[PDB]
RNA sequence: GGACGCCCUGCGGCCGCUCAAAAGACCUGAACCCGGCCGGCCGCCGGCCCGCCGGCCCCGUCUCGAAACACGGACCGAGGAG
RNA sequence: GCGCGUGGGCCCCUCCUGGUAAGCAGGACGGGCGAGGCGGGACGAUCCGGACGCCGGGCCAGGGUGCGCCGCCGGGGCCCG
RNA sequence: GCAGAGGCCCCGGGGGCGAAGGCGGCGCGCAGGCCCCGCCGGACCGGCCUCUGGUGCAGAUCUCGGCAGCAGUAGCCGCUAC
């Protein structure tokens, strides 16, 4: 329920890299694509251009994949799976899968409380019965 | 396996591995082995010696069966003999019981000599025998008999 | 159209390759009489490789 | 590859690929052909139940100095051979 | 920025591990590497490399060659990273102790009929990881026809046969031809 | 397909792209045109079959039967084998023609839980395959190898279970999903015939046995191997540079008199 | 496959009804585009409470060289080429 | 060993041929652009510096330091830029 | 990342106690992308391992379908007329 202490999580870039000329056209979706033009201001990386994706922006290995709570995430879609995930696991937390129905989530939460594995989405889909 | 292929990785690059200054266009070097005496003489001379010209007499029909002549070396004659029989033969020697191997029956017509026969005497039967082969078997005390 | 600029940089990219050890000591172009006598001298006493 | 050292290909150019007689012969009927020949064979066997499907054929030296040592099966026994046993051809 | 392009000569690439799916070859390589990491014996480093090489760089050695090579020393245990193969020409075969990666069944039968054990690299690690009284042997690497076709057939100093049928006279009969 | 229509490139000068267009002016005959031929049409000339050497096929079938014997390989594949007494499971079952008789055999030999994993695993598929006559998928269960024991009728409708005469074991069956390790309920004739079946293979000789990581570890831990090992030189001390001049103790390591 | 009542000169509207749902001429109902109501003064990138300072030419493409008074491109969706 | 692109190049030096001469036409050592971000030279693909992972300090090249627009004063000489 | 195929998902994977899909909002990843939440929707859908391919689009005077601004614009000026 409480994560091990760990080290400060530093994110090198706060805002997502966006593809060149994403703002100008709806057809160009924000998904990053490498600058490929012969005379692309982006490929050259001229002053005032959007930043380019580089391995340098990599998060510290120990903090990589870790969620803000301090635990990491391993998804669970059933109760058997949750007992396997928590077995010998004080470094991870379980997000109930979106597919899991409201009826089944009650079983997962009740087992999780016994297991001691934190559930990130414990309040999801809670509306009494049918 | 299409997934694990160079072309799929090169998607997203435009020219797809074929260049900008020169692009993939249809047959820009001609089709087939063409221009081997003109534009491609450099390659044909460098890697293809004897490609152009006529060099020999012509047989309008070739009768493969008569031009077929299988040969066996003097080293493998003992190998043809089965092992159980062969191991005793070498210790026993004996002019009277010397092994007869009809290389023709095994499937070879001419005996050439590439190696050395074992000293125990052997009688070889074949359609033809090379002179070095005749000499070596004669040294091992064997006989080069002919077969019909 | 003719121009040889960048030829020396291209040649020196990993060049200045020496000829090879077999080339320096070879029996090619040597005096045929020298070659014949050399084989006879070799074919005697320790150097002889004849069976 | 592009030039370099490649032996030249001796496969002839495809003909009648777009129009004309079908010069491609597919073999996806091959397994079905096997069942068909057995079924025709089974039907024929029953029609002459006591008799063997194959007739007696003669041992014959395989032709050429290449295979002159071995023997194979020929179309039919010679009149002289049948006379030696004492059987007329019919 | 630093000038690292003057006296540095680029990075060569070598086979650190076998690319063979066979888990037994991969296991032996790890074992002979682990031994050489501990005891730096040349024989163990060289075996590790020869296990790693490809089939083309791992040519077969017949019982006949092994007989000639070990003629001086019967005691010494021969080691071949490639498979051993039978020689039908060698009617009589000596007594040999050979650790091969694989033995042709006919060769295995002949060597053991002559009283000599057909060892395996698993046996070698168990008895002599050091390689005391052991010789590492290799097949003629240039025995493949592919190795005699390499080159430009056609230049005057070629000594390389043309690649394909040819059947013409230009160049085929002398430098003066053409 | 797409070639059935008549379309001609209108040509340059009409302010329209040069792609074949019909009488109306409708784009046709191109991979990009709607109704056009695919750029490289699929053909049945493709090689749908891949050749395998007999030896390699036999090696695989044999290593698959061998995998069944490994106790963990079966559990790894996904069979439920805790109640199974032994691997390989050899069961003397006489001719069985009734599912209830076969079910009792399977229950009394430890395989009911595997059969129940299969029975309670039937669901509709996740794709157009549902529509393409492949609607239901079940979990694969035991393989009963039968020789002259006519148990085929009894075991056929049991869920997830399959049958195969020792005459023709199938490698796609032995390893379902290219993952070997299938519980096989051998009839007793099938085991007693395995040495016959595997010798009737012309002069095929079984691949010689090899080693395992544990049997490479035991070999590695042998006294001779450990005795050869020579400990290495003690490693280097790195210690990141700090200014030596600033501190008295720090300067004393390099300049004690100073 | 639309109970009723209310009105409407009338149209039609309005309620609601049937049904799990209007699913109402039809399953889901995206983008473009547009109308109300509300909220701002505004392209992008960075710093900051957030409207100020600083930096930013329009891509693709041939090309020695493109922001080019070179060429193609209104916009969006689907299809589209080792 | 096995391939790929490329086989229209252009500039800055320095020596050139040639033309009366050019952002001219041909040659060559090197470097540069091509395919090299960044700072400066007001502006300039090539000039002067610097040749690039993501960053936080410090140092400081080249060019500058009235104000735009970051950053300077002191001394000697000269003066209708 | 896509779409199928063979397996697995320890009482036999997730689903009317709400699937796929759509719309906004977090979170993780250098990114390709993923995940979860809320809402709509209304029956299917996956993760890993092995396999397959007709497998990823800003352009091609691209194809087809939709549709904007121009724009309540140009115009509705033949045949004498109500």
CSV table of N, CA, C and O (backbone and C1' of nucleotides) in Angstrom, one decimal, chain A residues 34-47 52, chain B residues 20, chain C residues 9 13, chain E residues 1-5, chain G residues 63-67, chain H residues 9 31-40 45-53:
chain,number,residue,atom,x,y,z
A,34,UNK,N,9.9,11.1,-37.9
A,34,UNK,CA,11.3,11.7,-38.0
A,34,UNK,C,11.2,12.8,-39.1
A,34,UNK,O,10.6,12.5,-40.1
A,35,UNK,N,12.0,13.9,-38.9
A,35,UNK,CA,12.0,14.9,-40.0
A,35,UNK,C,12.8,14.3,-41.2
A,35,UNK,O,13.8,13.8,-41.0
A,36,UNK,N,12.2,14.3,-42.4
A,36,UNK,CA,12.8,13.6,-43.5
A,36,UNK,C,13.0,14.4,-44.7
A,36,UNK,O,13.5,13.9,-45.7
A,37,UNK,N,12.7,15.7,-44.7
A,37,UNK,CA,12.8,16.6,-45.9
A,37,UNK,C,14.2,16.9,-46.3
A,37,UNK,O,15.1,17.0,-45.4
A,38,UNK,N,14.5,17.1,-47.6
A,38,UNK,CA,15.8,17.5,-48.1
A,38,UNK,C,16.1,18.9,-47.5
A,38,UNK,O,17.3,19.1,-47.1
A,39,UNK,N,15.1,19.7,-47.5
A,39,UNK,CA,15.3,21.1,-47.0
A,39,UNK,C,14.4,21.4,-45.8
A,39,UNK,O,13.7,22.4,-45.8
A,40,UNK,N,14.3,20.4,-44.9
A,40,UNK,CA,13.4,20.5,-43.8
A,40,UNK,C,14.0,21.3,-42.7
A,40,UNK,O,15.2,21.0,-42.3
A,41,UNK,N,13.4,22.4,-42.2
A,41,UNK,CA,14.0,23.2,-41.1
A,41,UNK,C,14.2,22.2,-39.9
A,41,UNK,O,15.2,22.4,-39.3
A,42,UNK,N,13.3,21.3,-39.8
A,42,UNK,CA,13.4,20.4,-38.6
A,42,UNK,C,14.6,19.5,-38.7
A,42,UNK,O,15.3,19.4,-37.7
A,43,UNK,N,14.8,18.8,-39.8
A,43,UNK,CA,15.9,17.9,-39.9
A,43,UNK,C,17.2,18.6,-39.6
A,43,UNK,O,18.1,18.1,-38.9
A,44,UNK,N,17.3,19.8,-40.2
A,44,UNK,CA,18.5,20.6,-39.9
A,44,UNK,C,18.6,21.0,-38.4
A,44,UNK,O,19.7,21.1,-37.9
A,45,UNK,N,17.4,21.2,-37.8
A,45,UNK,CA,17.4,21.6,-36.4
A,45,UNK,C,17.7,23.1,-36.2
A,45,UNK,O,18.6,23.4,-35.3
A,46,UNK,N,17.1,23.9,-37.0
A,46,UNK,CA,17.4,25.4,-37.0
A,46,UNK,C,16.9,26.0,-35.7
A,46,UNK,O,16.1,25.4,-35.1
A,47,UNK,N,17.3,27.2,-35.4
A,47,UNK,CA,16.8,27.9,-34.2
A,47,UNK,C,15.3,28.1,-34.3
A,47,UNK,O,14.8,28.4,-35.4
A,52,UNK,N,13.7,17.6,-31.1
A,52,UNK,CA,13.8,16.4,-31.9
A,52,UNK,C,13.9,15.2,-30.9
A,52,UNK,O,14.7,15.4,-29.9
B,20,UNK,N,18.3,9.2,-54.4
B,20,UNK,CA,17.5,10.4,-54.9
B,20,UNK,C,18.0,10.9,-56.3
B,20,UNK,O,17.2,11.0,-57.2
C,9,UNK,N,42.1,12.4,-50.9
C,9,UNK,CA,41.4,12.1,-49.6
C,9,UNK,C,40.7,10.7,-49.8
C,9,UNK,O,40.8,10.0,-48.8
C,13,UNK,N,41.7,7.1,-47.6
C,13,UNK,CA,40.6,6.8,-46.5
C,13,UNK,C,41.1,5.6,-45.7
C,13,UNK,O,41.0,5.7,-44.5
E,1,UNK,N,34.9,19.6,-30.1
E,1,UNK,CA,34.8,18.2,-30.5
E,1,UNK,C,36.2,17.6,-30.7
E,1,UNK,O,37.1,18.4,-30.9
E,2,UNK,N,36.4,16.3,-30.5
E,2,UNK,CA,37.7,15.7,-30.5
E,2,UNK,C,38.0,15.1,-31.8
E,2,UNK,O,37.1,14.6,-32.5
E,3,UNK,N,39.3,15.1,-32.2
E,3,UNK,CA,39.7,14.4,-33.5
E,3,UNK,C,40.0,13.0,-33.2
E,3,UNK,O,41.1,12.7,-32.8
E,4,UNK,N,39.0,12.1,-33.5
E,4,UNK,CA,39.2,10.6,-33.2
E,4,UNK,C,39.3,9.9,-34.5
E,4,UNK,O,39.1,8.7,-34.5
E,5,UNK,N,39.6,10.7,-35.5
E,5,UNK,CA,39.6,10.0,-36.9
E,5,UNK,C,41.0,10.1,-37.5
E,5,UNK,O,41.1,10.1,-38.7
G,63,U,P,18.5,15.6,-58.5
G,63,U,O5',19.0,17.1,-58.4
G,63,U,C5',19.3,17.9,-59.6
G,63,U,C4',19.3,19.3,-59.2
G,63,U,C3',20.5,19.8,-58.5
G,63,U,O3',21.7,19.9,-59.3
G,63,U,C1',18.6,20.7,-57.5
G,64,C,P,23.0,19.1,-59.0
G,64,C,O5',23.5,19.6,-57.6
G,64,C,C5',24.9,19.6,-57.2
G,64,C,C4',25.3,20.8,-56.4
G,64,C,C3',24.1,21.5,-55.7
G,64,C,O3',23.9,21.0,-54.4
G,64,C,C1',25.5,23.1,-56.8
G,65,G,P,22.5,20.7,-53.8
G,65,G,O5',21.9,22.1,-53.6
G,65,G,C5',22.2,22.9,-52.4
G,65,G,C4',22.0,24.3,-52.6
G,65,G,C3',20.5,24.8,-52.7
G,65,G,O3',19.9,24.9,-51.4
G,65,G,C1',21.9,25.9,-54.3
G,66,A,P,18.4,24.4,-51.2
G,66,A,O5',17.6,25.6,-51.8
G,66,A,C5',17.4,26.8,-51.1
G,66,A,C4',16.0,27.3,-51.1
G,66,A,C3',14.9,26.3,-50.5
G,66,A,O3',14.0,27.1,-49.7
G,66,A,C1',14.3,26.7,-52.7
G,67,A,P,13.9,27.0,-48.1
G,67,A,O5',13.0,28.3,-47.8
G,67,A,C5',11.7,28.1,-47.2
G,67,A,C4',10.7,29.0,-47.8
G,67,A,C3',10.7,28.9,-49.3
G,67,A,O3',9.9,27.9,-49.9
G,67,A,C1',10.9,31.2,-48.6
H,9,G,P,29.7,17.2,-63.4
H,9,G,O5',30.4,18.5,-62.6
H,9,G,C5',30.6,18.4,-61.2
H,9,G,C4',29.5,19.1,-60.4
H,9,G,C3',29.8,20.4,-59.8
H,9,G,O3',29.8,21.5,-60.7
H,9,G,C1',28.7,19.1,-58.2
H,31,G,P,41.7,18.2,-46.8
H,31,G,O5',40.6,19.1,-46.1
H,31,G,C5',40.9,19.9,-44.9
H,31,G,C4',40.3,21.3,-45.0
H,31,G,C3',38.8,21.4,-45.2
H,31,G,O3',38.1,21.3,-44.0
H,31,G,C1',39.9,22.8,-46.7
H,32,G,P,36.9,20.3,-43.9
H,32,G,O5',35.6,21.2,-44.4
H,32,G,C5',35.3,22.3,-43.6
H,32,G,C4',34.6,23.4,-44.5
H,32,G,C3',33.3,23.0,-45.1
H,32,G,O3',32.2,23.2,-44.1
H,32,G,C1',34.7,23.9,-46.8
H,33,C,P,31.1,22.1,-43.7
H,33,C,O5',30.0,22.3,-44.8
H,33,C,C5',29.2,23.5,-44.8
H,33,C,C4',28.7,23.8,-46.2
H,33,C,C3',27.8,22.7,-46.8
H,33,C,O3',26.5,22.9,-46.3
H,33,C,C1',29.4,23.3,-48.4
H,34,G,P,25.7,21.5,-46.0
H,34,G,O5',25.7,20.7,-47.4
H,34,G,C5',24.7,21.0,-48.4
H,34,G,C4',25.1,20.3,-49.7
H,34,G,C3',24.9,18.8,-49.8
H,34,G,O3',23.5,18.5,-50.1
H,34,G,C1',27.1,19.3,-50.4
H,35,A,P,22.6,17.6,-49.2
H,35,A,O5',22.9,18.0,-47.7
H,35,A,C5',22.3,17.3,-46.6
H,35,A,C4',23.4,16.8,-45.7
H,35,A,C3',24.4,17.9,-45.1
H,35,A,O3',24.5,17.7,-43.7
H,35,A,C1',25.5,16.0,-46.0
H,36,G,P,23.4,18.2,-42.7
H,36,G,O5',24.3,19.0,-41.5
H,36,G,C5',24.5,20.4,-41.7
H,36,G,C4',25.6,20.8,-40.7
H,36,G,C3',26.4,22.1,-40.9
H,36,G,O3',26.1,23.0,-39.8
H,36,G,C1',27.8,20.3,-40.2
H,37,G,P,25.4,24.4,-40.0
H,37,G,O5',24.3,24.4,-38.8
H,37,G,C5',23.0,23.8,-39.1
H,37,G,C4',22.4,23.3,-37.8
H,37,G,C3',22.5,24.3,-36.6
H,37,G,O3',21.3,25.1,-36.5
H,37,G,C1',23.4,22.2,-35.9
H,38,C,P,21.5,26.7,-36.0
H,38,C,O5',22.5,26.7,-34.8
H,38,C,C5',22.0,26.6,-33.5
H,38,C,C4',23.2,27.0,-32.5
H,38,C,C3',23.8,28.3,-32.8
H,38,C,O3',23.1,29.4,-32.1
H,38,C,C1',25.5,26.7,-32.7
H,39,G,P,22.6,30.7,-32.9
H,39,G,O5',23.6,31.8,-32.5
H,39,G,C5',24.1,31.8,-31.1
H,39,G,C4',25.4,32.4,-31.0
H,39,G,C3',25.8,33.6,-31.9
H,39,G,O3',25.2,34.8,-31.5
H,39,G,C1',27.6,32.1,-31.9
H,40,G,P,24.6,35.8,-32.6
H,40,G,O5',25.9,36.3,-33.3
H,40,G,C5',26.6,37.4,-32.8
H,40,G,C4',28.0,37.5,-33.5
H,40,G,C3',28.0,38.3,-34.8
H,40,G,O3',28.0,39.7,-34.6
H,40,G,C1',29.2,36.3,-35.0
H,45,A,P,22.0,31.4,-47.2
H,45,A,O5',23.1,30.3,-47.1
H,45,A,C5',22.9,29.2,-46.2
H,45,A,C4',23.8,28.1,-46.5
H,45,A,C3',25.3,28.4,-46.8
H,45,A,O3',26.0,28.5,-45.6
H,45,A,C1',24.5,26.8,-48.4
H,46,U,P,26.9,29.7,-45.1
H,46,U,O5',28.4,29.3,-45.7
H,46,U,C5',29.1,28.2,-45.1
H,46,U,C4',30.2,27.8,-46.1
H,46,U,C3',31.3,28.9,-46.4
H,46,U,O3',32.6,28.5,-46.2
H,46,U,C1',30.5,27.9,-48.4
H,47,C,P,33.7,29.3,-45.4
H,47,C,O5',33.8,30.7,-46.2
H,47,C,C5',35.0,31.4,-46.3
H,47,C,C4',34.9,32.8,-45.6
H,47,C,C3',35.2,32.8,-44.1
H,47,C,O3',36.6,33.0,-43.9
H,47,C,C1',33.3,34.1,-44.6
H,48,C,P,37.4,31.9,-43.0
H,48,C,O5',37.5,32.6,-41.6
H,48,C,C5',37.8,34.0,-41.5
H,48,C,C4',37.3,34.5,-40.1
H,48,C,C3',37.4,33.5,-39.0
H,48,C,O3',38.8,33.5,-38.4
H,48,C,C1',35.3,34.4,-38.9
H,49,G,P,39.5,32.1,-37.9
H,49,G,O5',38.9,31.9,-36.4
H,49,G,C5',38.2,30.7,-36.2
H,49,G,C4',37.3,30.9,-35.0
H,49,G,C3',36.7,29.7,-34.3
H,49,G,O3',37.6,29.1,-33.4
H,49,G,C1',34.9,31.2,-34.8
H,50,G,P,38.0,27.6,-33.5
H,50,G,O5',36.6,26.8,-33.1
H,50,G,C5',36.2,26.8,-31.7
H,50,G,C4',34.7,26.4,-31.7
H,50,G,C3',34.3,25.0,-32.2
H,50,G,O3',34.8,23.9,-31.5
H,50,G,C1',32.9,26.5,-33.2
H,51,A,P,35.6,22.7,-32.4
H,51,A,O5',34.4,22.0,-33.2
H,51,A,C5',33.3,21.4,-32.6
H,51,A,C4',32.1,21.4,-33.5
H,51,A,C3',31.4,20.1,-33.7
H,51,A,O3',30.4,20.0,-32.6
H,51,A,C1',31.8,21.1,-35.8
H,52,C,P,30.6,18.8,-31.5
H,52,C,O5',29.3,19.1,-30.6
H,52,C,C5',28.3,20.0,-31.0
H,52,C,C4',26.9,19.5,-30.6
H,52,C,C3',26.9,18.0,-30.3
H,52,C,O3',25.8,17.7,-29.5
H,52,C,C1',25.6,18.6,-32.3
H,53,G,P,26.0,16.8,-28.2
H,53,G,O5',24.6,16.0,-28.0
H,53,G,C5',24.1,15.2,-29.1
H,53,G,C4',23.0,14.3,-28.5
H,53,G,C3',22.2,14.9,-27.4
H,53,G,O3',21.0,15.6,-27.9
H,53,G,C1',23.0,12.8,-26.7
